[PDB]
């Protein structure tokens, strides 16, 4: 929670942080999928991204 983060956290757990970082990554992937949806063809490149 706070041993090395430095920035104070009021109170929470540990795996929590893995979930937050994975959420950021998966949100970027979801945005890529959305862009793939926008370009019907010429859009699977964003799917691969």
């Amino acid at each position: 929670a706070s041993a090395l983060l430095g920035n104070p956290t009021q109170g929470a757990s540990a795996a929590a942080l893995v979930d937050q970082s994975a959420q950021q990554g998966f949100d970027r992937a979801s945005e890529a999928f959305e862009e793939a949806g926008f370009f019907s063809s010429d859009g699977l490149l964003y799917g691969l991204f």
Binding site: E34, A36, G37
Partner: protein, 57 residues
């Protein structure tokens, strides 16, 4: 009178030609609308505003 009758008949066939053009345009518009609905469904499935996921229990 027969000449004017045949002229009116030609006018009727002209009207049918215009109607067929209008039907073709409507056909094209309908296909475009179906494509738009497909893409709306696709966007709804892949929207980044979705927040759900399966739960481990």
């Amino acid at each position: 009178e027969l000449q004017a009758r045949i002229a009116g008949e030609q006018a009727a066939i002209q009207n049918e030609t215009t109607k067929l053009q209008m039907i073709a345009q409507l056909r094209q518009a309908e296909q475009a609308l179906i494509s738009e609905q497909r893409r709306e469904r696709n966007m709804r499935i892949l929207s980044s505003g979705n927040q759900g996921m399966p739960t481990i229990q």
